Every structure is written in structure tokens, then in C-alpha cells.
């Protein structure tokens, strides 16, 4: 492939460099339309800019935490972090979010990796070996109420059991209700006067509940869960302007008030170098 062809002096009536940008086109002008060039080859394919590659590496999408401790006398397991749920999202930690929102609709399978590490912040004789249970709870399933409910039987709901310190990995097909996930949605769920704007089920990817299977030892053990997400089989439509201001909320476009100028001011003139 040639990156530049050889081209010499020109004295024409045919001027490729004068255009009318009002038309909305970006005319494909090249170095050889306005200087004299020599042949050179590309030596490159643009492999690593493919959208499959761009969205295809694992990104941290969620960090939560649960603890193993005596539940005796706990009136609210959920509240003691005896167990914890997470409604899956890709817009809570901003790194991956800005990447996805370069597109309007996106379609892909997900590969999740879940790393779990334990901490024992206060005096323990040892490090126990805990098994985590991660249950995938689709909308309409009974939700766990205690850390050892009938729910955890999970007879119809996919669940994975792995050890703290290890990693669990499985992949879920594209679960969207429509043909693509909406990265944006300028609508409501119905014509209600007060219903929420922008947040939609069109994006919904399920939800996940974590708990330790082990009963309690004498000390307490903090287990912190990190969920990583990798898109595989990516398809993206309609590019948009990149995110400039900071994010404030999952699912709305809102930016913070009295934010700071995002364009760097010159130290000098327009004329400055």
C-alpha cells in the first residue's frame, strides 16, 4: 500500500485544495495535492484501532465489599455487608464509560472476571479460606434477604462459587432487550409528567449478588470484590463528540455546576507558539 505517491510541480485550473466546508463534507485532501512528494508505503494496517480491539480489554467496572462475621443479632444482613448486590452498569467508573460513549448504540457479549481479596484489619490468628458465591439475579427473581436465604439455592439462576484470592470468569451473551444497548436515550418510560428522563431499561444488563459461603470464625474478615468487564464481538453505531466535562451520575449526561474551563488558555497571544 502506498502512503504517498510521487507527485511533481502543478500549474493547473484544477485546484483540489479550495473547497466549501459549508457542505458538511471533509474532502479527502493529501500531501501530494499541495507539495511535491516521493513514494512511501504504509507498512501498517490499523489493526489496533478496530472497535473490537478498542473495547476488547478488561476494565474495572465495580468494586464492592462484603464481610464474614457472626450474623447473630444482625437485623439487616444487607446493611451489615453480610452480603451485597450490584445492578450491572458500565457507567459508574469513568474510564470505560468515556470509551463506550464515543458511540450511541453498542452491541457485544461480555466476559466478566471477578477478583476477590481478603483483608483482616484487626488482630486475627490467621487468614481463613473463604469461598465467595456470585449469583446473577435477573429482574423478577426473588432477591436475597439474609446471607443464607432460600434464594441462594439458585436453582434456576446462574451462580459461580470461587475462593477469595482467586478469580472467577464466565461470559454472558448480549442480554439487551433491543438490537443494541442505548448509550444514550432522549426519552422516558412513558408519557408521565414526573417520570425519570434518560435512564432506561434499554441498557439493563442484569444484576449480581455476592456473599461468603463460610460461617464465621472468631475474627472478622473483609472481602473486597472487583468486577472487570471485557466486550467481545463488538458492534458500534453512530459516533458522537467525546465527553468533555466530568460525570455526576450513572445514566444522565449531567455535568457539575461551576465546573472549570476545559479548554487550556494560552500563556500568551493567539500569535504565540
Amino acid at each position: 500500500t502506498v502512503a504517498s505517491i510521487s507527485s511533481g510541480p502543478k500549474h493547473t485550473q484544477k485546484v483540489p485544495i479550495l473547497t466549501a466546508n459549508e457542505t458538511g463534507a471533509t474532502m479527502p485532501v493529501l500531501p501530494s495535492d499541495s507539495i511535491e512528494t516521493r513514494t512511501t508505503y504504509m507498512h501498517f494496517n490499523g489493526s489496533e484501532t478496530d472497535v473490537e480491539c478498542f473495547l476488547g480489554r478488561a476494565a474495572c467496572v465495580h468494586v464492592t465489599e462484603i464481610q464474614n462475621k457472626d450474623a447473630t443479632g444482625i437485623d439487616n444482613h444487607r446493611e451489615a455487608k453480610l452480603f451485597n448486590d450490584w445492578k450491572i452498569n458500565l457507567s459508574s467508573l469513568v474510564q470505560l464509560r468515556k470509551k463506550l460513549e464515543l458511540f450511541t448504540y453498542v452491541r457485544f457479549d461480555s466476559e466478566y472476571t471477578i477478583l476477590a481479596t481478603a483483608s483482616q484489619p484487626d488482630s486475627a490468628n490467621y487468614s481463613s479460606n473463604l469461598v465467595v458465591q456470585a449469583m446473577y439475579v435477573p429482574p423478577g427473581a426473588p432477591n436475597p434477604k439474609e446471607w443464607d436465604d432460600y434464594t441462594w439455592q439458585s436453582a434456576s439462576n446462574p451462580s459461580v462459587f470461587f475462593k477469595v484470592g482467586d478469580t472467577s470468569r464466565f461470559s454472558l451473551p448480549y442480554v439487551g432487550l433491543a438490537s443494541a444497548y442505548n448509550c444514550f436515550y432522549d426519552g422516558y418510560s412513558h408519557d408521565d409528567a414526573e417520570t425519570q428522563y434518560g435512564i432506561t431499561v434499554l441498557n439493563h444488563m442484569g444484576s449480581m449478588a455476592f456473599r461468603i459461603v463460610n460461617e464465621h470464625d472468631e475474627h472478622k474478615t473483609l472481602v473486597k470484590i472487583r468486577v472487570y468487564h471485557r466486550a467481545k464481538h463488538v458492534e458500534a453505531w453512530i459516533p458522537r463528540a467525546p465527553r468533555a466535562l466530568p460525570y455526576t451520575s450513572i445514566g444522565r449526561t449531567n455535568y457539575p455546576k461551576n465546573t472549570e474551563p476545559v479548554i487550556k488558555k494560552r500563556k500568551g497571544d493567539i500569535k504565540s507558539y
Binding site: 432522549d186 463528540a241 467525546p242 444522565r252 449526561t253 455535568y255 476545559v262
Partner: protein, 255 residues
């Protein structure tokens, strides 16, 4: 003697002529078309009013003055009240449509000024409150009036800050969306053909707008000496290939 410059668009019972065009944009290089069976889901036969809905509606005019910040209309909202297009809209459960948008602004060879005319698929607005405040329905359904970016923040309304496109992105990059400029010195109209763009084959016309049309002054209007300091901008829009499905009782929407 054909120029890129003169054009005629006849759609239904209405025709537009421009003698100072700058080509026309067809979003994503695709022209509006009906919904193919292979893509269909709802089993209902659809209704295609054709020429009674696919004609040109001219919205009320705006006034560009030296202080203007820009205006924003949503589709199909802007047309919610135009003739039979609008009736069909409130009466069917689902509908689908593409449009021809023609924005008009003429001046003289002594004026200067340049407007950006852009179509943004799925333009989800931001609340000026920040945090996770929502933007109420009425605020994103201004109707033919559209939203005036130089109007004041209101409560439950969107933010109207132009350098941020009403969503946290910079004005400068709106050029990645199908768009055309109106530069008084060149141009006097902008025309964009919009194919139907959605993640579902057909949708509700009232709970979801699928494009915002935005006209934004970028190089300020500058009139000749002792000229009146303003020009009107007119927007005429025509639904094209419209289909309605799931007819019934007639939606009632807030406000």
C-alpha cells in the same frame, strides 16, 4: 447549467426552491426507507398516509440577533401539531419516520455570520442542577417552539450552555454529526435528509424523540452599517416515509 446551488424539493403537495444551496447532507449516507419485514417485530399491518403526512411543515420563525445563543428542536416533537402528521402521532401506539430538514436564512453581500445546522441522534440533555436531577418531560417536549438556548435556566428543564451541547461535550466536536453550515457569504439554506435511526424497528412517538435539530450562530451576525441588527431564521421540515402502527384511543401526554 445545474449548480450545486439551485435546488427544488417537491414532497407531497409542497415544494421548496433554493437558489443558493451548498449541496445537501444525507445522514450517514442513507436515505429514508420503510421498515422491511426481515426487521419487523410487531405483527400489525402499518398505515402509510403518504402524501398527507409527507409534505413540508414550516415552523414559526426565529430571530437571529447579535446576542443569540442558538435554538434546539426535537423530532418528532416539533411536528406534534402539524396537520394529519400530528393526529396520526397521538392516535397510534407506534410510528416511524425520516425527514427532510430545510433551514433558511438570507441576508445580503454586506452581512457576515455563520450558523451550524446539525442533527444529533439520541440527544439526551443534561439537567443544569448537576448530580442526578432529571429533566422533566415538558422541558424536552417544547413542540414547535423548540428550546431557546439563550432563555434562562428553569426548574426541571435542561442546561442551555452552548459550549457544551446541552450534554457535557464541546461545541467544536458537533461536526462529527451530519451537519451543514449557513455562511451568509456562501449559503442561504441548509438541507439534511434524516433516515430513521433507532435500536428498535419502530418506537413510541411521544415518549422518545430520536433526533434534535440544532441551529447555532458560531460567527456572530454582523450587519452592514445602520442596517437593522437582526435576520429571521425559518425551519421547514417534512416527514418522509412515515408509517404508523397500533391504532387505538389517542394518547394523553403531560401538560
Amino acid at each position: 447549467g445545474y449548480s450545486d446551488r439551485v435546488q427544488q424539493i417537491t414532497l407531497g403537495n409542497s415544494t421548496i426552491t433554493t437558489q443558493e444551496a451548498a449541496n445537501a447532507v444525507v445522514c450517514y449516507a442513507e436515505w429514508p426507507e420503510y421498515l422491511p419485514d426481515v426487521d419487523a417485530s410487531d405483527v400489525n399491518k402499518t398505515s402509510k398516509p403518504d402524501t398527507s403526512v409527507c409534505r413540508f411543515y414550516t415552523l414559526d420563525s426565529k430571530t437571529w440577533t447579535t446576542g443569540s445563543k442558538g435554538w434546539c428542536w426535537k423530532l418528532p416533537d416539533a411536528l406534534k401539531d402539524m396537520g394529519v402528521f400530528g393526529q396520526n402521532m397521538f392516535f397510534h401506539s407506534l410510528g416511524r419516520s425520516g425527514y427532510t430538514v430545510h433551514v433558511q436564512c438570507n441576508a445580503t453581500k454586506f452581512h457576515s455570520g455563520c450558523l451550524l445546522v446539525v442533527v444529533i441522534p439520541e440527544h439526551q440533555l443534561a439537567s443544569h442542577e448537576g448530580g442526578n436531577v432529571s429533566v422533566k418531560y415538558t422541558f424536552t417536549h417544547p413542540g414547535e417552539r423548540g428550546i431557546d438556548l439563550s432563555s434562562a435556566n428553569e426548574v426541571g428543564g435542561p442546561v442551555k450552555d452552548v459550549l457544551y451541547n446541552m450534554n457535557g461535550t464541546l461545541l467544536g466536536n458537533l461536526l462529527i454529526f451530519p451537519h451543514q453550515f449557513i455562511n451568509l457569504r456562501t449559503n442561504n439554506t441548509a438541507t439534511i435528509v434524516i433516515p430513521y435511526i433507532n435500536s428498535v424497528p419502530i418506537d413510541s412517538m411521544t415518549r422518545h424523540n430520536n433526533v434534535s435539530l440544532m441551529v447555532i450562530p458560531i460567527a456572530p451576525l454582523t450587519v452592514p452599517t445602520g442596517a437593522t441588527p437582526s435576520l429571521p431564521i425559518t425551519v421547514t421540515i417534512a416527514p418522509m416515509c412515515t408509517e404508523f402502527s397500533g391504532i387505538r384511543s389517542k394518547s394523553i401526554v403531560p401538560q
